[PDB]
Paper text:
The mammalian integral membrane proteins SIDT1 and SIDT2 are classified into a superfamily of putative metal-dependent hydrolases called CREST (alkaline ceramidase, PAQR receptor, Per1, SID-1, and TMEM8), in which alkaline ceramidase 3 and adiponectin receptors were reported to possess intrinsic ceramidase activity.
Despite of similar domain organization, the structures of hSIDT1pH7.5 and hSIDT1pH5.5 assume distinct conformations. Significant changes occur in the TMD of each protomer, particularly in TM5 and TM6, which lead to an open form for hSIDT1pH7.5 and a closed form for hSIDT1pH5.5, triggering rearrangement at the dimer interface (Supplementary Discussion S3). Notably, the Zn2+-binding site also undergoes rearrangement, wherein Asp574TM5 moves towards the Zn2+ ion, enabling direct coordination with it. Additionally, the cholesterol density near the extracellular juxta-membrane in hSIDT1pH7.5 is absent in hSIDT1pH5.5, suggesting that cholesterol has already departed from this site at low pH.
Author numbering:
A (entry chain A), B (entry chain B): 36 to 275, 286 to 336, 442 to 649, 686 to 822
Write the structure that this text describes.
């Protein structure tokens, strides 16, 4: 019978053994070592077959006390479109075993067998090395390299006090894709292409990756971090001595404490309660100085828009929480602090203003309308020859739209995805349309188009946006049709509004044509909803400026409060647009590329760009509504 | 150096070798064989270690010309909640290599090494057998068994003419879950627990599985079918000499031809064009004898309900087509014939009636209303003393609701899922509500409650159903609250309708109470939408029956046409309810259990139960609308 000790070559690590194997010859080595308590040893085996022989690959088998590994040196990879790749260098890290004080020192023996079947012979070069840079320490960086045939992984241990950690992986050249996974300390370790996704959380990456881990999940307070490169780049982007070495740096940082949550919640509440306090102060000062269809329409639309998206997001959040695959939601993982089951608590809590300011506007408008109704009940002719008709439902509709926009934004931000690209700024379309309607009605007679003209406009706009996003991704005929429709609509609106100021119509038409040429030359926004939002904002601001300049030309003085509100609205809009143009993650494109643009939070240790955008949008919209309400105070 | 031939034991298949291995001993066998053209050989290796030693398992390594396999005899499995399982028998099928005429007969050698590290010794029993039942033949069944540590797989070759095939797998006892996968002929073959989902389509199963394959996808017109059992049953259902042997039967059947598509399309078109032909003939015979809000409301609801679900189903269909994981959509895979990119063509084409019948009803109502308007223009006092007020909006609303319910059902059936349980019968809620409103208005004065009463009713009903399904799955407090609200609503409706027939209110209340007791004792419908549909249908039929009986008690003769329409409506309702009660697949429950209840098509070779349900529902609704329209013809 075969005797390993008899034919084994008592060998030592770090010596590059070389050999040649025939059909009737096999080589075996008998490495030995010892492990001591409080230390972790991880052996690594490198095998390079100098020859390129492919019909008779060299077969390598590593035997330990309780595990067996095996592979070939000329590793062969098969890729789509019938492509073949051959790698002539292979490496593997053996699963380590801990040694406790009770167990004491442990002696370990490892056998390595190299054998082939070539009739003439195949060369091989074998190296076995120990690992000193195996463990990882919190806050200390680390650099290394990986290859499609040389997967890597390391060990981390939970400190005494840390209850949550973040793993950040950074690279420079994103040519070959990669996968980063976290697993428990239970051999075997799945560090292969076809089994790395079986267990533990994982993330595909090309230039950036971030994973947040708690403590209660892992027994023993330790885990393995595995990095695996991929033969082809189809999954994470474009198309595909062969080698694809990729350099990586890995950092582990403790997570924030609950004190940050308390601070952020208190700040968010109080910053917006200050507005109510100021309104109460102003009302007190004024008192001292003195000393329909929209309802059910909005209710139905809100329920219709809420139930489906709400259930869809519930299901997506549950699935992402259960399966552990962090490639479904398009979060901004660098700053996403979870609470309870929620995965991104900040992005939802940052929507408090959209509700609070809407509530304040509703309260103020209701009080003003009730006061005007009481005054009319008392009757006064000063509001007839020196007054204009008053309407109330429009402002309530605007405020309810603001509330619904806030709730929709929160629901969408629960888990962003390509199927929820709308519901993020959808209701601001309605807000802009309502402001347009209010401006149109205030100057000209009522001539109300009931309420369904705006409904049809919104339905058509959503139709066109969805059609363009889902189909107009790469086509231009639809783009030409949309441009023609937009130009025709602009001309028709200009003609209708027209019937000293004969050049404003030409100015608006020329601005629209300039935008037409701009995106025709650029011809690649790829975000139809964003451009629709921008165009609505542009038209609203243009109409507001035209109306204000016309009022100025009419030789009347504007009350100071409308002027202050105008300036505040302008500044807030500027800031909000600045924070909006910043891009963090995007539903379009593969998840690996979406995370390629992430940032590590601004302001406090909680918020980031998008939260500031939410805040500034809420404030700017509130000030615009107040300006619209109060602009015509001097007329009475 | 090590010499394989020197220590190799020239062995033969089917002989159960036995041995004992120590630290310094390792046994090797050197099996040999030859492969001839037009035949496929697949060796299989069984290894059983009699001892239960966990600390010192036996290591087995199989070496071939181009592949190496390795494993341990006492296989260890880790399961959730810190559970461990050990299997003492292992088996494996080597990847076969085809032998072509040009290549000629091919000699093959296979080395098997058994080695351990026990200080005393470990026993082992090894068997190597050839496979004669490896290939699969079309339409011929096959029985076999599998175990968590003994995965199986077989080969299939595409016949000359078959362009599409179906693989059906059947079992009897669904205790241990299983996975069935299809892969190409390219070694290695992933038949392990942690890598079986990497490549090729796959399906989790417990009692039934079905997979449809085309021909152009596979080069060589051949493929491997792999069956893998699972250590635990958490994924596919409940909780978890150890063994879990599972018996399976596999059949392969050629798919249908395009002639079936042509036949089914022509039949579906003509069966429903027959209604228009009959209406035209009736109009011809009659001629020979003679010889606003709803619009915009429904149009807005159309987009508001279509765009989210339409885009969402687009995304699901694209993803399921791309990845190849057949566990997202809850189809009925036994009868799902795809066309182009669509995966279930029949379930969509079976919705032609919901549109055609609605269009016919709209046309007939428009013609009748226009004729009545012309007659009124001519003026006739007969329709005053012996006439009743005429209305038209409700009938148009009903027709549009039907025409939109058809499209909603089609969109939902594009890819059924737990996030789309509505949109299958939602619009018929509004249909029943409108029928009730029309019945209320026809007898009592107009007293139109505008149109938003039913709007709020529908919104509240949908909200309640969604809340119950998402949350009231295992709770009873919500169920008690819902029952109390239903009883209160029934009492209020009876009181309002009341103000010879003093017992009808008691009868309706008692029927509602009987339903209360029924679903309280059963207390497990777990389909809130289904029971909402049932209750709405029951109330509609109940009110219609009481109205008709009251009219009968009024001592007037009913025109034969309304009687015929009533009888046809009753018969169609009975048939539709019968076809509805049949259950094929269900979004609730794991996908493995959902496919556990599937059926192999009825009627032609295309349709099944659900399509017949669609047809019968459309016909019954159309006849009910016609009955409502024509019920009071005798009055004039
Ligand atoms: C086996 O490998 C060796 C390569 O070193 C070759 O065979 C050797 O041939 C020489 C010359 O006759 C002998 O002195 C050695 O004893 C042989 N060794 C062995 C292990 O066979 C050859 O490449 C291989 N064997 C054959 C038959 O080609
Ligand atoms: C197999 O090939 C690789 C690369 O072809 C060899 O790696 C070399 O390692 C030395 C050691 O410092 C470096 O100086 C060389 O630069 C490396 N090669 C290259 C191309 O950079 C490796 O030694 C070969 N053999 C084994 C067993 O790995
Ligand atoms: C090796 O296996 C054998 C069991 O078959 C044991 O060692 C044998 O011991 C007898 C008695 O001294 C010798 O005659 C044999 O030559 C030995 N065989 C071998 C392969 O060493 C024992 O179980 C194992 N070896 C040890 C050291 O325990
Ligand atoms: C390992 O154990 C299994 C079962 O424990 C053995 O399988 C037996 O095979 C014979 C051959 O027909 C059957 O008659 C027995 O019924 C099987 N066992 C049982 C429990 O049913 C097997 O022979 C053992 N060894 C190997 C190498 O498989
Ligand atoms: C009433 C309005 C203001 C609420 C707006 C925020 C809503 C959308 C938020 C607040 C609380 C959230 C829920 C809190 C907890 C969980 C449990 C988790 O396993 C699934 C998601 C689910 C069910 C969340 C879904 C989104 C949610 C309902
Ligand atoms: C405009 C909105 C976002 C403002 C915040 C209001 C709502 C959404 C907030 C207020 C209090 C919050 C809850 C506070 C505590 C918990 C318990 C935790 O285990 C799950 C999340 C859950 C249930 C939170 C979900 C979101 C929540 C309901
Ligand atoms: C950001 C992507 C979606 C493209 C859209 C950009 C939008 C937000 C930008 C681009 C051009 C901008 C406009 C340029 C000029 C003016 C005139 C000024 O008196 C009021 C603001 C207004 C009308 C701007 C509003 C914001 C605007 C419309
Ligand atoms: C004409 C009126 C409406 C302008 C008021 C809005 C202002 C604040 C907006 C309009 C265009 C915006 C800029 C558009 C593009 C860039 C380049 C980017 O790398 C930094 C931000 C920056 C510089 C933006 C900052 C905010 C910005 C200047
Ligand atoms: C106009 C009305 C009657 C149509 C109602 C059925 C709708 C939902 C059907 C008709 C055509 C269908 C499309 C036909 C082809 C494909 C390509 C596939 O890769 C994604 C789905 C997609 C895009 C289908 C989605 C569903 C679809 C849009
Ligand atoms: C349910 C009701 C509304 C459907 C009635 C409209 C019919 C005619 C529509 C609905 C879906 C459509 C199909 C959608 C997708 C494809 C795949 C394409 O490669 C050929 C055309 C084909 C096969 C379409 C033909 C027309 C079609 C069958
Ligand atoms: C099938 C699941 C969702 C449970 C609901 C079952 C429904 C559809 C069943 C159960 C009880 C049935 C009702 C029982 C009695 C009557 C009175 C009769 O004069 C007309 C039929 C009618 C009105 C039935 C209609 C169908 C019905 C409502
Ligand atoms: C005509 C109107 C009043 C409807 C009357 C109710 C009739 C049509 C319905 C109500 C309950 C139904 C039954 C409920 C359950 C089953 C068991 C199933 O394995 C076969 C069909 C069968 C036997 C159904 C046949 C149709 C049925 C009898
Ligand atoms: C190495 O020495 C012998 C040789 O195999 C081995 O039995 C022993 O366990 C090892 N001890 C150490 C300290 O490496
Ligand atoms: C083992 O002993 C060392 C001695 O310093 C101590 O630091 C360590 O915590 C001990 N470990 C265990 C598991 O007892
Ligand atoms: C079996 O016989 C020898 C023994 O190793 C082997 O070389 C040869 O290829 C095999 N031939 C056949 C016909 O099986
Ligand atoms: C090989 O020869 C046999 C002889 O009957 C023939 O049937 C078969 O088609 C041939 N196959 C190839 C690939 O030439
Ligand atoms: Zn946002
Ligand atoms: Zn259906």
């Amino acid at each position: 019978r075969r005797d390993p000790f008899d034919a084994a070559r008592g060998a030592d690590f770090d010596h590059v053994y070389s050999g040649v194997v025939n059909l009737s010859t096999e080589n075996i080595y008998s490495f030995n070592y010892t492990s001591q308590p409080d230390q972790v040893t991880a052996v690594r085996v490198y095998v390079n077959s100098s020859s390129e022989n492919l019909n008779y690959p060299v077969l390598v088998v590593v035997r330990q006390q309780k595990e067996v590994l095996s592979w070939q040196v000329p590793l062969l990879f098969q890729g789509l479109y019938q492509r073949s790749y051959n790698y002539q260098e292979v490496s593997r890290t053996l699963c380590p075993s801990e040694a406790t004080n009770e167990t004491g020192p442990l002696q370990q023996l490892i056998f390595v067998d190299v054998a082939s079947m070539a009739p003439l012979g195949a060369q091989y070069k074998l190296l076995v090395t120990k690992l000193k840079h195996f463990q990882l320490r919190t806050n200390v960086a680390f650099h290394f390299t990986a290859s499609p045939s040389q997967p890597q992984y390391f060990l981390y241990k939970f400190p005494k006090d840390v209850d949550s950690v973040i793993i950040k992986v950074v690279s420079e050249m994103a040519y070959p894709c990669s996968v980063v996974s976290v697993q428990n300390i239970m051999c075997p370790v799945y560090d292969l292409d076809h089994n790395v996704e079986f267990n533990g959380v994982y993330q595909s990456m090309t230039k950036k990756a971030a994973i947040t881990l708690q403590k209660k999940d892992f027994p023993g307070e330790q885990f393995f971090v595995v990095f695996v490169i991929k033969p082809e780049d189809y999954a994470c982007g474009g198309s595909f001595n062969l080698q694809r070495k990729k350099n990586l740096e890995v950092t582990i940082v403790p997570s924030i404490k609950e004190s940050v949550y308390v601070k952020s919640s208190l700040f968010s509440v109080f910053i917006f309660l200050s507005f109510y306090l100021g309104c109460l102060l102003v009302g007190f000062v004024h008192y001292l100085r003195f000393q329909k269809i929209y309802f059910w329409n909005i209710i139905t639309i809100a329920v219709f828009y809420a139930l489906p998206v709400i259930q869809l997001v519930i299901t997506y959040q549950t699935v992402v929480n259960v399966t552990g695959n962090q490639d479904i939601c398009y979060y901004n993982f660098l700053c996403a602090h979870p609470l309870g089951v929620l995965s991104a608590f900040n992005n939802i809590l940052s929507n408090l203003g959209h509700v609070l300011l809407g509530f304040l506007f509703l309260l103020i408008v209701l009080r003003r309308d009730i006061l005007h109704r009481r005054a009319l009940e008392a009757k006064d002719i000063f509001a007839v020859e020196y007054g204009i008709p008053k309407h109330f439902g429009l402002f309530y509709a605007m405020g309810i739209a603001l509330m619904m926009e806030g709730v929709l934004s929160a629901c969408y931000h629960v888990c962003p995805n390509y199927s929820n690209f709308q519901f993020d700024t959808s209701f601001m379309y309605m807000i802009a349309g309502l402001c347009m309607l209010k401006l149109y009605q205030t100057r000209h007679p009522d001539i109300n188009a009931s309420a369904y003209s705006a409904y049809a406009s919104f339905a058509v706009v959503i139709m066109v946006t969805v059609l363009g996003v889902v189909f107009g991704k790469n086509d231009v005929w639809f783009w030409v049709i949309f441009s023609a429709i937009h130009v025709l609509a602009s001309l028709a609106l200009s003609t209708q509004i027209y019937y000293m100021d004969r050049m404003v119509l030409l100015v608006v038409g020329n601005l629209v044509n300039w935008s037409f040429a701009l995106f025709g030359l650029i011809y690649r926004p790829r975000d139809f909803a964003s451009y629709m939002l921008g165009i609505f904002i542009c038209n609203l601001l243009l109409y507001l400026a035209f109306y204000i300049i016309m009022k100025l030309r009419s030789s009347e003085k504007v009350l100071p409060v409308p002027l202050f509100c105008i300036v505040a609205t302008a500044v807030m809009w500027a800031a909000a647009l600045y924070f909006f143009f910043q891009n963090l993650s995007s539903w379009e494109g593969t998840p690996a590329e979406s995370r390629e643009k992430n940032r590590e939070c601004i302001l406090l240790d909680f918020f980031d760009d998008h939260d500031i955008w939410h805040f500034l949008s809420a404030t700017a919209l509130f000030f615009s509504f107040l300006v619209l309400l109060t602009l015509d105070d001097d007329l009475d």
